[PDB]
């Protein structure tokens, strides 16, 4: 019921449809559905803070049109 943006370190901006009650975990699942990135690779940063999976957008008072920042985990083998 609201739109937020997810900005990458690659010059890409993702638009997501979310609700205040969505957990960060849910937001990551939505990013997976839309963009193909597994949730365990995603870290989401907002206003100098890394957001935690069990918290909701409402917990952080994240308003519509807000921009979250995505940094990927790196794993090599």
């Amino acid at each position: 019921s609201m739109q937020i943006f997810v900005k990458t370190l690659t010059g890409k901006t993702i638009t997501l449809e979310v609700e205040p009650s969505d957990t960060i975990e849910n937001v990551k699942a939505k990013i997976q559905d839309k963009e193909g990135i597994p949730p365990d690779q995603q870290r989401l940063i907002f206003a100098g803070k890394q957001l935690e999976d069990g918290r909701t957008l409402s917990d952080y008072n994240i308003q519509k049109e807000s921009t979250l920042h995505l940094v990927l985990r790196l794993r090599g083998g």
Binding site: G11, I45, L72, L74, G76
Partner: protein
Amino acid sequence: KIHAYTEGGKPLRTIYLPKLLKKVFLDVVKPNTKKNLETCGILCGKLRQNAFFITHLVIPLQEATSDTCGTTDEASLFEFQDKHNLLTLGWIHTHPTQTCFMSSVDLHTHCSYQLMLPEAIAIVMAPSKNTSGIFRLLDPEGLQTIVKCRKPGLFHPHEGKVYTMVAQPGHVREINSKLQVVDLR
């Protein structure tokens, strides 16, 4: 002079890679390599006149084994890249004892970088074989296979061709440019 395209016909912008980067990376991580520990770095840079320039090799806080390496503090990594306006253009890592190829872990990692930047490259160094390669997934077919892959196991194989070396010549051009190494460890 060069127009590079993905397997699906999408134009790829040039990435200029300093010819010194591979050797410098091996020098910087050599103590890890000698202990039979993998190490990774991020290829960071800038977009200028529709081309990417790698300007910074960033060694993030990480943990490793003889078979894996991985970042541990991506929030600090973000903060560094954000402050200095550096794009993520790719990554590099060592195979201290293995041949040069993209492993299962490499493919699942790189897929996400390449989805976020069609030009993203993975550089793999195999110092015990004196070999190296610069890889990317087939786009769109390899990316689709990895996105849908639900095969369990850290080291599972894949069916079909999923990845390829970058072409010579192609969208990655090795040149005599400056390089800064940033060690955040």
